[PDB]
Write an enzyme that holds these catalytic residues in place. Structure first.
Site, PDB file in Angstrom:
ATOM      1  CG  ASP A 128      53.612  41.267  36.769  1.00  0.00           C
ATOM      2  OD1 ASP A 128      53.250  41.165  35.802  1.00  0.00           O
ATOM      3  OD2 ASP A 128      52.724  41.919  37.713  1.00  0.00           O
ATOM      4  CG  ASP A 139      50.215  42.859  33.531  1.00  0.00           C
ATOM      5  OD1 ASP A 139      50.978  42.165  34.197  1.00  0.00           O
ATOM      6  OD2 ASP A 139      49.975  44.107  33.861  1.00  0.00           O
ATOM      7  CG  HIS A 208      45.582  47.356  35.361  1.00  0.00           C
ATOM      8  ND1 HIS A 208      46.275  47.335  33.921  1.00  0.00           N
ATOM      9  CD2 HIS A 208      46.310  46.603  36.124  1.00  0.00           C
ATOM     10  CE1 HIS A 208      47.176  46.547  34.053  1.00  0.00           C
ATOM     11  NE2 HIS A 208      47.315  46.156  35.322  1.00  0.00           N
ATOM     12  CG  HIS A 216      48.104  51.304  35.218  1.00  0.00           C
ATOM     13  ND1 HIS A 216      49.248  51.772  35.689  1.00  0.00           N
ATOM     14  CD2 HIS A 216      48.160  50.002  35.529  1.00  0.00           C
ATOM     15  CE1 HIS A 216      49.920  50.770  36.350  1.00  0.00           C
ATOM     16  NE2 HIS A 216      49.230  49.771  36.455  1.00  0.00           N
ATOM     17  CD  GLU A 241      47.690  43.177  38.995  1.00  0.00           C
ATOM     18  OE1 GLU A 241      48.639  42.718  39.289  1.00  0.00           O
ATOM     19  OE2 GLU A 241      47.673  44.012  37.973  1.00  0.00           O
ATOM     20  CD  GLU A 336      48.587  41.069  35.983  1.00  0.00           C
ATOM     21  OE1 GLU A 336      49.646  40.654  35.778  1.00  0.00           O
ATOM     22  OE2 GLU A 336      48.043  42.188  35.689  1.00  0.00           O
TER      23      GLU A 336
HETATM   24 CO   LIG Z   1      48.745  44.247  35.992  1.00  0.00          CO
HETATM   25 CO   LIG Z   2      51.321  42.291  36.118  1.00  0.00          CO
END
Ligand SMILES: [Co+2]
Ligand SMILES: [Co+2]
Length: 355
Positions: A128, A139, A208, A216, A241, A336
């Site tokens: 990640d 992300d 998020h 976030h 995700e 994700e």
């Molecule tokens: Co994330």
């Molecule tokens: Co992530």
């Protein structure tokens, strides 16, 4: 030029006119076209970061193998990401540390200095990692395995993430996306070393919304039923995700902490304690409100900083994010993507030919 074998040409040098490739554009489940075009510089910054993410992860899949240490894997990945994003202080760079969480650990592990952990044949590793241009963050994450015994668990979670991506849209309730994800994930049953499991979503992990320099931004995307009926809005950006587990389907804090991030809402705080003041200045200059890890402080020549770091956490200026793990012996997987809710369409900006 064209890109090199082991990648070394920055994405911005591959696309000389400053216009980067779109991700997958989707109809949602005039004036709006004018509104979309008005934010074109923002979409383009996300696309530059996404093409770096695509090229880095393809390279990673080519060489990651059991027998490497986790530190070797993270350093080799981050070296390539810094090159392709054309790192430049807070204008372009890494948005957050490389997660490489193993087995029952689902998220927020990256090695600190001295960690001797070696990747094994039976490990399930969640890679990640994040890139940004001007604070516009990608992300995106995938799971690496070497034993085919985990194939159905990986398929369950990939299908659940794709289901959340298809359900998402302007005016869609976030609780509906969660219910949808859980319904697909729980339709899968897997058999690993003679034991069978129904795959469960990890109920206290979530997607998020994303804001500028703010991984976030305040809304959360649940992966089980029962969450808020708050709606997704035009112009928002989300990390969709999902995580699947053979364990309890709940994570707890465990192991040593490696990931930290300044609290976005805390303002300037005058500090006189010398080592604590210096470290806060280092964080403000190099990371701002983006996440960092201890290896990234070591790389800047900092040492003996752990008590200053604790002080900033105890003051609430910085927050620690320890590894999040399900029970011993369980297996967890993650997929994700980052999506943009544009006025004319939903763009899965980090989609590739891989996932
Ligand atoms: Co994330
Ligand atoms: Co992530």
């Amino acid at each position: 030029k064209v890109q090199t074998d082991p990648p070394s040409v920055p994405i911005c040098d591959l696309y000389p006119n400053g216009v980067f490739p779109k991700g997958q554009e989707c109809e949602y489940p005039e004036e709006k076209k004018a509104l979309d075009q008005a934010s074109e510089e923002i979409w383009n910054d996300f696309r530059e970061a996404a093409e770096a993410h695509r090229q880095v992860r393809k390279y990673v899949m080519s060489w990651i193998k059991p027998g490497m240490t986790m530190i070797e894997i993270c350093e080799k990945l981050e070296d390539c990401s810094r090159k392709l994003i054309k790192e430049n202080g807070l204008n372009a760079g890494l948005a957050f540390p490389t997660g490489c969480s193993l087995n029952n650990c689902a998220a927020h592990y990256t090695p600190n200095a001295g960690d001797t952990t070696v990747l094994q044949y039976d490990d399930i590793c969640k890679i990640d990692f994040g890139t940004h241009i001007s604070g516009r963050i990608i992300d995106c994450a995938f799971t690496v395995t070497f034993n085919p015994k985990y194939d159905t668990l990986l398929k369950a979670v990939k299908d659940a993430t794709n289901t959340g991506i298809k359900c998402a849209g302007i005016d869609v309730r976030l609780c509906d996306v969660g219910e949808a994800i859980q319904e697909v994930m729980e339709s899968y049953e897997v058999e690993i070393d003679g034991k069978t499991y129904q795959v469960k979503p990890i109920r206290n992990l979530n997607g998020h919304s994303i804001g500028q320099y703010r991984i976030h931004a305040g809304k959360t995307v649940p992966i089980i039923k029962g969450g808020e009926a708050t709606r997704m809005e035009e112009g928002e950006v989300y990390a969709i995700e999902t995580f699947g587990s053979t364990g309890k389907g709940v994570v707890h804090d465990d192991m040593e902490c490696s990931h930290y991030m300044k609290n976005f809402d805390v303002g300037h705080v005058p500090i006189r304690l010398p080592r604590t003041k210096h470290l806060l200045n280092v964080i403000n200059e190099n990371f701002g409100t983006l996440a960092f890890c201890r290896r990234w402080l070591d790389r800047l020549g900092e040492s003996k900083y752990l008590m200053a770091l604790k002080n900033l956490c105890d003051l609430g200026i910085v927050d620690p994010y320890p590894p999040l793990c399900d029970i011993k012996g369980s297996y967890t997987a993650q997929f994700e993507h980052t999506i943009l809710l544009r006025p004319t369409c939903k763009e899965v900006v980090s989609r590739g030919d891989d996932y």
